[PDB]
Structures are given as C-alpha cells and as structure tokens.
Amino acid sequence: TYKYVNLREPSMDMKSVTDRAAQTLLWTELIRGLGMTLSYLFREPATINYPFEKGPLSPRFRGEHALRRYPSGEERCIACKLCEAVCPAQAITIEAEPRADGSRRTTRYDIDMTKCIYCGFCQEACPVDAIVEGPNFEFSTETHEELLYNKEKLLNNGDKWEAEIAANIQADYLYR
Template sequence: MGNAMKQLMASLALRELWQGMAVTLRYMFRPNITIQYPEERTPYSPRFRGIHVLRRYEGGEERCVACKLCEAICPAQAIYIEIDTESRADKRLTKVYDIDLFKCIYCGLCEEACPVEAIVMGPYLDMAYEDRNARFYKKDQLLANGESWRAEIDARLNADAKYR
C-alpha cells in the first residue's frame, strides 16, 4: 500500500515532467554544437572522396588515355566509357565518359586504377538535383569540375602523394 501511495503522489506532483524540464534547462545554457549547413561547413578529411573530376595537363590536354581501367574496376558499374576512334593516331581519347552518381559508392577504386591520375575524387559532395537525369555526369561536366577545383585537388594530391 505504501508503494502505491508513493506512485500516486509522484504522478500527482508530475515528478517526471519536472525532471524532464530540469534536463532541458541544463542544456539551454550549454554552447550550441549545431552547424548552419550551407553557410558553415565542417572540415573534410584530406582523403575525403567527393564528386568525380577529370583532370587536364597544364597545357590543357586531357589526361585520360581511354584505357578503361576505371570502368573495369568499378564495383557498382557506374562508369561508362566509349573510345573516340576518330581521334589522333598517337593518343587514344574518350568520346563518352559518363558517371552515374546514384550508382557510385565513392570507393575511390577508379582513382587508384588510373595510371595517369586523370580521374580523381573531388573535394565536394553537394548533390541536390531537381531532375533525375542530372545524376549522370558527362565528360564536359567532369572536366569543368576539374578546372574549377584545380587548386584544392592539387593540394590534396600533393598532401597524399607519400601514400600513393
């Protein structure tokens, strides 16, 4: 009978409610740890693997030699390459270089397989698309990413060079 009376008194005094309010009050005066995402970003690891990038040489020539090793090693089969048969006789080039970003698992095997470091993982991973077909990155988009993120990519590759 005594235990039942204690429970009744505790429920009438709303003890659980006051305990919850005490926890809330304690957390109100602690510093915020929330990050306002698009304006503020957490720092990424130097080995972060983001959206793919095709690189060019300093002279503007494409690095990709159409060896198709990245397509062969991709476990998700997210890369599709067609060789340009009309290209120069001394160097093979790609006519089509597509990556399906929804299939990609961002493992980085394509980057490791490339003998000339033509494809690397970029420093960003912002993928918000209004159109489902925007998930396919074509060759010109990949090359444009390489040009716009060149400084960040070069810095990351230089920092990671001793591990390659």
C-alpha cells in the first residue's frame, strides 16, 4: 500500500477563496508558527547541569579499558591472546612468558587507545573476564602519549574501577 503526500485539489467556493486571501494578506500561517516557538519558550528546557548532573548510562556501557583480578588478587589474564586476535583495530599488543612460578602471564599488554574503536570485542573474546571496558568516559588527556596504555596503566585502571566494574558485570552477565 502507498499514500499520496501532496496531491490535493483546493476548494474554489467563495469562503475557501477568501480564507486563503486572508491567510495571504494577514499571514495567518506565519502567526501560527510563532505560537509554536512561543509555546516552547514556556516549557522547561532539557538541559542538564553537567558536570554536576550526568547523562544516564547502562551497565553495558563501553568506556575505558581495565585489567581485572580474581578475589585473591591474581590477574585474570592468562595471555591467551584472543583479545589481540579479535581486535578489529589491531590495538592490542601482547607478549608473555612463564612467570617466576609456573604461571602463564603477560609481560607486555598494551592498548593503543587512539587505535581502539571501543567496540568491546576484546571483552567478548576474553574467556576469563580479564579485559573489560569500564564505565569511565572522562579520561581525555593533554598529550597523545598518555593514551598509549601499557600493562601497568591497565592494571591500575582495574584496581581503580573494580568496585563499579564488578557490579556492572553482575547486572549484565546473565545476558551474556
């Protein structure tokens, strides 16, 4: 089915022809348009008072990256390199070797935050919930180099944001 958006024949009776004459000379349809912007003047605006008020987000939000630990404090990351393989932007760089004990752990874990597209494939790919995108979106920097995160920066992010991150995973993991 279709409909016509603009296929009208206007009435030619005297009343309709005078109603259009008054509209042309008295600008009635232009005054009607003033009424609508007047009605907005007296509405409450939609502005929020940033940074005192914040735009609503959900637990799924994809923000700054972090590397997480188990409750014991051991790193979750096992240097499987699945996040590095799936990264659409090739933003992750990883090196690994046996730790001083026998553990399989990374020696390099970099994210070029200026290559990253914040797509979240890395946290989907991770089998142990080690790499996540956190809820933080207020980390703009004065230099480019400050956005090339090494493993120390990402572990600090996890230690900094774990309290919020764990609660967000708790809200969403049954959808995953």
